[PDB]
Design an enzyme around this catalytic site. Structure first.
Site, short mmCIF file in Angstrom:
data_model
loop_
_atom_site.label_atom_id
_atom_site.label_comp_id
_atom_site.label_asym_id
_atom_site.label_seq_id
_atom_site.Cartn_x
_atom_site.Cartn_y
_atom_site.Cartn_z
CG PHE A 1 -0.76 -0.03 12.77
CD1 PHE A 1 -1.72 0.31 11.85
CD2 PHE A 1 0.29 -0.83 12.39
CE1 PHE A 1 -1.66 -0.19 10.55
CE2 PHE A 1 0.35 -1.34 11.08
CZ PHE A 1 -0.62 -0.99 10.17
CG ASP B 1 8.50 -11.51 17.18
OD1 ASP B 1 7.75 -11.77 18.13
OD2 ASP B 1 8.09 -11.48 16.04
CG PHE C 1 16.57 -4.74 4.62
CD1 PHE C 1 17.39 -5.83 4.61
CD2 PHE C 1 16.68 -3.86 5.68
CE1 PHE C 1 18.26 -6.07 5.67
CE2 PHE C 1 17.51 -4.09 6.73
CZ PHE C 1 18.31 -5.21 6.72
CG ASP D 1 -1.93 -5.56 11.76
OD1 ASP D 1 -2.29 -4.47 11.23
OD2 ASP D 1 -1.48 -6.53 11.13
CG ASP D 2 -1.23 -8.50 17.39
OD1 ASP D 2 -0.74 -8.54 16.25
OD2 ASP D 2 -0.52 -8.26 18.39
CE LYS E 1 -1.15 -2.49 3.74
CG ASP F 1 8.25 -15.63 9.50
OD1 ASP F 1 8.84 -15.78 10.58
OD2 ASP F 1 7.47 -14.71 9.19
#
Lengths: 341, 341
Positions: free
Chosen positions: A231, A166, A90, A235-236, A49, A99
């Protein structure tokens, strides 16, 4: 804000590609590497977007006395917007490899393409490098040049730190709900997402406008990291309860042992019977073992808790703008708030 | 040159680690990420010979009026030497993943360690980021600061370009000897190896010494890229004919379909019977299919061709120093030439 400027922003991409693939058309020998760079750019910087790059351009126009907004200054704004988009590209190319994702933006991840594989690691590194080639080509003689170099480098480092956090917190494959805490959740969001997605683009425009003060940046940052937290929480929430034909997405957070806002809340809200049902169901293939979690979230009124959180978060962000926007125009911030709320 | 300074260089590492893991000991929340960064540093920046970082320190001492060589200036020199070593570590951690290597410096590659795997991609990115944190911490108030940022960024980009060229040229698994040409070989060496290994460290010391002129840098670069070409050619030669108890290594270039100097020479020197024997043997598991290549190289007197090339290359480098060293002391260059010849 966004609708108007997008047109010109996406169109500048062609020129970004030219410049990056033609500074070494006087160096024949690396031709084939440059062609590969072109392919990496086109596949990975296009198709999202562009909200973060656009924010640079919109913020720039709101911040710069219209008098100083010639053809050249705007072109630098589009270029620096595109740099934010390259930083993004990147990160995503590389995160997709980490992932083991299959698709991104509904198309095949770059590293999954036949013939690419782990070469994508170098491809991602080239995307990062392209940021600094653009700054140099377009901005080296500007007085904010070094400010922008440092902001992009710092944004990369924070994002990487966040990613490490994370990865330690949330290995795809090891349930240990003990590490899914609120303080840790906020931490991951702030470093991995909010700094580059919300502070980076406004800060960049601030510097291009002469606003280099530590205080102003500290003030803006305070508002923007708080927006970034909302935000991501949204999202979650929407990963699971969003209408899939509205998101264009369909969430797999629970399968992937994510440190979602939802599971954090859940773990604050559970009696032990629930924790076990969570320990025994969080993050499996099985659809029905995921069902048991989406169901348990509903049994704890997490949609309502979210709805409450979003109301509170919106008043809270508005008070932050009241308090910390000046002397920037509140609109710089309010345009983003309208976009995310 | 090297023996003396090494001591102090390796010892400064402890302080490099302190500074990088303590600027965020006022940020509790990222503690676990910082501990991981510490582990990444210690495992990957330590254990090599440090020739490139040391070169920074040695070159600095030869270039700076001894009057301006206080405690603080030397400490910056050690720090910038360590930055070159971090750039190196970043490249190697990542290249090891791209190659699927097993060991490095005779120990298990970082990504092969249980629990690391593809998370090493982010680890490599952190190593890169550490370069710019050190420059900022140690050099932000120096007048060469931006010069050094740009040199490291440019060195990364050239190395990455070189890597892309290597990856296109030499996929582990696809014999196509048609792409193993001399012009392409030199190209890969120059971008992937010579710029960061030979130009980077002297250039950095040049800037720390005030020598920022384009001409001086162009002159030094001309000598140093030529040295880098020899160093790598010697590496390719020794990969196969070096005494393994002298290199501490044992080469697998031919197995890996490498664009070695040797195969380039071979392909210039082959009748078609030989090319087929090369097409049919270059780059297999089989020891005896590798034997047939090492044997064929010997049948074309590549050891003698190398010996001739090394004599010529040494006269040629000496003439370059005569011609292009001034006004730098020829010793800056001659110390490196002694090290590699």
């Amino acid at each position: 804000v966004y609708a108007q400027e997008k047109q010109d922003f996406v169109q500048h991409f062609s020129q970004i590609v030219r410049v990056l693939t033609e500074d070494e058309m006087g160096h024949p020998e690396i031709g084939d590497a440059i062609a590969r760079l072109k392919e990496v750019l086109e596949y990975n910087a296009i198709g999202g977007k562009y909200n973060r790059g656009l924010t640079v351009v919109v913020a720039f126009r709101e911040l710069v006395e219209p008098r100083k907004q010639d053809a050249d200054s705007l072109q630098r704004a589009w270029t620096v917007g595109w740099c934010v988009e390259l930083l993004q590209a990147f990160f995503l190319v590389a995160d997709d490899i980490m992932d083991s994702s299959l698709t991104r933006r509904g198309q095949i991840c770059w590293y999954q393409k036949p013939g690419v594989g782990l070469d994508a690691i170098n491809d991602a590194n080239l995307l990062e490098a392209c940021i600094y080639r653009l700054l140099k080509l377009y901005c080296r003689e500007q007085p904010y040049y070094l400010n922008l170099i440092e902001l992009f480098l710092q944004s990369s480092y924070q994002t990487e730190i966040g990613q490490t956090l994370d990865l330690l917190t949330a290995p795809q494959g090891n349930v240990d709900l003990v590490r899914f805490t609120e303080k840790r959740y906020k931490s991951i969001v702030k470093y991995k997402t909010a700094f580059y997605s919300f502070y980076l683009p406004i800060a960049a425009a601030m510097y291009m406008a002469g606003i280099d003060g530590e205080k102003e940046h500290a003030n803006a940052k305070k508002i923007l990291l708080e927006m970034g937290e909302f935000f991501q929480i949204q999202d979650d929430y929407l990963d699971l309860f969003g209408d899939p034909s509205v998101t264009g997405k369909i969430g797999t957070d629970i399968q992937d042992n994510k440190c979602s806002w939802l599971v954090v809340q859940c773990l604050q809200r559970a009696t032990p019977e629930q924790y076990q049902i969570l320990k025994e169901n969080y993050g499996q293939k099985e659809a029905e073992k995921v069902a048991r979690v989406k169901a348990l979230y509903e049994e704890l009124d997490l949609p309502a808790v979210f709805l409450q959180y979003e109301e509170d978060s919106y008043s809270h962000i508005m008070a932050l703008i009241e308090q910390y926007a000046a002397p920037l125009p509140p609109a710089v911030f309010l345009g983003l708030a309208r976009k995310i709320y």
